[PDB]
Symmetry: C5
Subunit: 310 residues, 5 copies
Amino acid sequence: PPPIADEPLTVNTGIYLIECYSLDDKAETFKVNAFLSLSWKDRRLAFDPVRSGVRVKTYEPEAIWIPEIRFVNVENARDADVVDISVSPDGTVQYLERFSARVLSPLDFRRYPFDSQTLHIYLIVRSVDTRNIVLAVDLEKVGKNDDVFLTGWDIESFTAVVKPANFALEDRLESKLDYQLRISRQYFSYIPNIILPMLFILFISWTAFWSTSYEANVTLVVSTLIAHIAFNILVETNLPKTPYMTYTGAIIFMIYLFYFVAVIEVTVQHYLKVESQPARAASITRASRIAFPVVFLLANIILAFLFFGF
Amino acid sequence: PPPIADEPLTVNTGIYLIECYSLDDKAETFKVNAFLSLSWKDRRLAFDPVRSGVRVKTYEPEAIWIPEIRFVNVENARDADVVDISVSPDGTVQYLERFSARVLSPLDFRRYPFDSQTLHIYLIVRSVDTRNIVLAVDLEKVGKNDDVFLTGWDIESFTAVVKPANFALEDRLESKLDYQLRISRQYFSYIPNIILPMLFILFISWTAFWSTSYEANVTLVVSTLIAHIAFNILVETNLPKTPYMTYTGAIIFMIYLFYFVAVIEVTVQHYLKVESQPARAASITRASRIAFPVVFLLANIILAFLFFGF
Amino acid sequence: PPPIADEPLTVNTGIYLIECYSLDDKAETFKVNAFLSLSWKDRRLAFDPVRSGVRVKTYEPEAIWIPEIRFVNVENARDADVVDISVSPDGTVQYLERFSARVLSPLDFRRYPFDSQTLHIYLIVRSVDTRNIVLAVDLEKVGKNDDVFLTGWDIESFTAVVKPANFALEDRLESKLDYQLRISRQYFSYIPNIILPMLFILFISWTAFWSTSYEANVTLVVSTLIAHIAFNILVETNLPKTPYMTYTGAIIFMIYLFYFVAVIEVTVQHYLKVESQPARAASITRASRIAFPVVFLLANIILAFLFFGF
Amino acid sequence: PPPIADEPLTVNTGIYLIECYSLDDKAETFKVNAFLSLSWKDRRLAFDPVRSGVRVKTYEPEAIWIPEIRFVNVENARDADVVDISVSPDGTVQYLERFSARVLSPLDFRRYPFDSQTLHIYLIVRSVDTRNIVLAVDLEKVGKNDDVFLTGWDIESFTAVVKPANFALEDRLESKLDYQLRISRQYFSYIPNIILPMLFILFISWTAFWSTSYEANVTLVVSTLIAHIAFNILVETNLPKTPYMTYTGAIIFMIYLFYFVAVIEVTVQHYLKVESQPARAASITRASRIAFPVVFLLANIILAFLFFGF
Amino acid sequence: PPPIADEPLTVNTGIYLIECYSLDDKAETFKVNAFLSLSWKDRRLAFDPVRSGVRVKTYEPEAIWIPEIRFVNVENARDADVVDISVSPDGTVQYLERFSARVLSPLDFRRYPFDSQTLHIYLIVRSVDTRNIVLAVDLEKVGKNDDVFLTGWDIESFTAVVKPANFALEDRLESKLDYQLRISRQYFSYIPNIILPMLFILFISWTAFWSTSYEANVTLVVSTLIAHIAFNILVETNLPKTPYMTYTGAIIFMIYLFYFVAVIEVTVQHYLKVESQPARAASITRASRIAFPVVFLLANIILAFLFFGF
Ligand SMILES: [Cs+]
């Protein structure tokens, strides 16, 4: 029973994030518990203050006509319970629910551990024979308690795109809004657990430049390369099959090389010290002691600059 | 209360993929959130435009007769909420839901990491005493936003088989449609993480052709073979117990050999250099330095050509 | 409101497997989506063809009395939606649902990778004051599309035990039917991934019969025994804590021995070649080169014959 | 509308385990599908046999007053469908459902692989203004088909504590019953897969007493210690963070020592055979050859006796 | 239909924890099954004891006006079934449900294995045109059976913050309460499984101070460093990406160093014993034998004191 209008009836939205949780890097989703505030003029139940009752009349959903506000990027029918409905005298309705659905927003892992993110929540609404334009009321949209959680994420700002996008979707126009949740990752536990440990094994790898033994120079360069896959695999896991290249996937792969040419040098400091030419053997080996850490620290400024500095 | 017809009543379908997610290679399933558009002539509620009401009359499901459209390959009762029902004057009904069920479509892992896929969605409908033929309305079937996701898959096209298949199923005919979702895998993160790393270990394996020491030539060919199972097992995992052979399962298994005859050669460059015949030892070893990488690169052209080039 | 009979009313069943999926070796269960066809004479709503309506009258469940057909071995209340109900004039009712529950049938892993299986679906039905005997109508039981899936299983036949079993269960008799799904495993991906790889490591183990060095004869027999646990554990995982012995659990355990006596021989070819008696050392070692592969190939004909050939 | 009594109305319970499955050692829970039989005198619907109808009158739940029987230790609202309700003439009611909820019973892993267990199911019932005492009818409680499953567990007996416990819970007394399911584990697959394999690696560890080489005596004692953590971790996984000590957690930890002092001995048979005193070296080493296996077999009788024999 | 008051109507709450389970360190959530007791004066259904019926009248939810009590930090619409409603004569209502939702309370992993926790449950309630203040009745809040579980946690006390917090949330004030569950972790299974094993490998690492061989001094310091990542990774797993530093993450990382300088020393006891200056080699090596275990035991007093002792 939609509200007999004279033009496209505006509906006024608003979201108060109560809870934020379980951002799932692999699935690229997150759950959110929050308020959903709607409002519109339904002159059809304007109601004479003095003549009867009181300031505002409480209705049940079945009584009033209510605009079907569906979320766009959600796995399931959103999970809301209605909190209150209050009809002003002019025929203005005040709606409030408290939904909790899991949202499907994509993430950009280009700078993986040192990445910032922009999540999205949507709210389309399809028309009937009066058009429906949605729009935000920023007193109900300042939504985000001083308690929002999001484990392992710093939260930067909950804002929203005032101007909606009105679509042509199947002989009926809908109107879609963009609620933006901006976050930065708490990279850190990434260092004592992944970055640093990954680095130390790399250095011991090439302790084998200050050694003559092949027997102990494979037990060296090789034993570490194993340990590196332990880190490659640990990381390749809490992260999706990105069609692009990650920052960490970069240096985690750049590393694979300094083990290959490390295992190259130790191999050649042998078919060139068994060929009785240690003239050249402890010449190469001596150089590698600089070649490597420098090409590295250089390739990391080269790699690093390539990702953040552009 | 089915619509008194004069022939097999056509029902007009259509699916608008809103979301696609969680393609599960192991289970061979995927979840999809999408619209379901139906329509048919139910002359029984044709309704005199001028005489009453308006252009089109909105009903509730309980009011109208509605065709039971069940999905064929689905784990559970599909999870749909009804979006709108609009009855045209001629007795034509316009239905729209927004379901989200997980689909059971099989996948072909013959070219695993470099494989393209064809997923299926079904929609049977059983008859009563008027027959039901289903069919597609391609304005409601262009379904697939410019936002469909499918992590780690490039999506090629959402089309559908115009001509249905009408079955004889238990003294009542049903009519079944084929909605096709075509995708190609984003192989790539397969290289820096599986292909390349798997290769590197294979090369170091056979650095042991340029060495005399057995002590460091097992610490060599053996230490890597371990690391290979790390990749055999990493892969054997995100992939089902196929009754056929995978491309990667092939070369991952072809590899097992070049470690066996690699461990053969180093073993024989010993009971043939302890038998004081290093005449032959550093003859064999010298050859293997070519035999191997060539038999390989040859066996990979032989293997590769065998899978894609036919 | 049960159908006033003169004897135990027969109810006629039938199952049309639409989908089969997710057979879970560890949990010993499987999910199935299928039709459930029932029928019985309820003379109480026989209904005068000519006098009124039409050939057959469509009812809703609430209208008719319906026999509660519960599945026996199922995790949960089975998940069915009703497809159609049609009452013949003689008072004969025609019922069809389309359930999908996960079944708890046990499996026999005695021949694990080369095992064939027999799954079960049950359907009891408890009596009131007329007795209920169930029985099958084989036109509705030929159920199993030419599309049944069951990843990694070849499917042999869907049949069912015509004669039911009528129990005495709590002062009321029930009647239970046996629907049989026969399957064979697609062993194969078991070879290039488990059998073969497990074998190769075993052979390299005992490359250490053609070697003098203990240093490289432990880096040999020992380095492989590790890799074997990688396969013992990979297999011990996708398989339940069976109270009996598996075929693969057998040879996977028979193997553990040929590494123990292999590590025995290499150990004794040392406290018997450091005791300056290489007379005996390269005597034993020379024998083991045959002893082993033969005792093995013999113990596998002995083991193999013991499991399949009896 | 509760049955106007003259004293605390007794309700007569009973559980017929139809299915048992998925005992989850880590979570300490299990799922059960079973009957639930209740009965009580509600003289308020006693009903004159001859005067009307028949022997017993079938009602729907909404008709009769029914005692709310909630399970105590359950994750969720239990999942029951009602099977039949039959009211005797004296006003005696006969109820039967067929629930299936997952039960939260704790387990005692003190003897882990060789442990027996006692599971629990509960059924409280809160009072109104007539008191409710629950109690069991052992014809409906002999519940447990000759088909109960419980993968990897032998099932010993389904009994129940006749005498209930009546609580004072919030100004209303409740009455709680104890249904006991006793089981023993099928330890076995624990041997060829965990115990035995764990033992063999331990023996090879200390093959290094019959060797002089340190190079091959670390490749020995160390290479196995790795393989042991593979078993420590395999086991530490299918088992909860117990605040006590397991039998297997014991010997799996007692083992860690015989590797430490094994790695001690081989280390000292070196800074005491480089120090030109092989007088003492191949003295110690010679002893360890007995010291170890004996201290062990002794420590296992000491450990074993400590756990089962007390 | 809210109770016509003269001031802000107080509602009296209370929670009786029946079950506690599945505290999920990674997700920072826990499930709880419990009673929810509410009460308030609704003089509007005060009801003349003598004049009619009895002491207290039982209603159904639809009958009475009931305050919507929503939980704040919960994933979903809380999962409650209503247990009883009893209206006193003065118009006082007595409500009791038995909900079971999973709660989103944050945890502080600063002292990870030796950490104590404070969980939260919330209950807001939004106002209409009478204000609602919530408050606790400590006879119904002594809630926590003598059976509360919480695997791997010792439970210290269930209390609650008497004084509520009344918000200004969207032109309507709400009232929120704080129910506190205090717990301590059962660290312990952390020792025989993580702390101790992690330590032992560290000690063997530096058995290489009493050795001359580089070949066996890498097979030493290196083979252990691998095993350490096995523990770094085992722990980094059952623990969230904390933006701060854990105690165990500390010493697990402090450890990475004593392997680096350990692998430093063994490397330098070589380019300084091949440079014929074993004067200095077995001088350094001799010192490290003390330097290390002391700097460590000192750095652990330094680290330890830094975390708990402040
Ligand atoms: Cs080695």
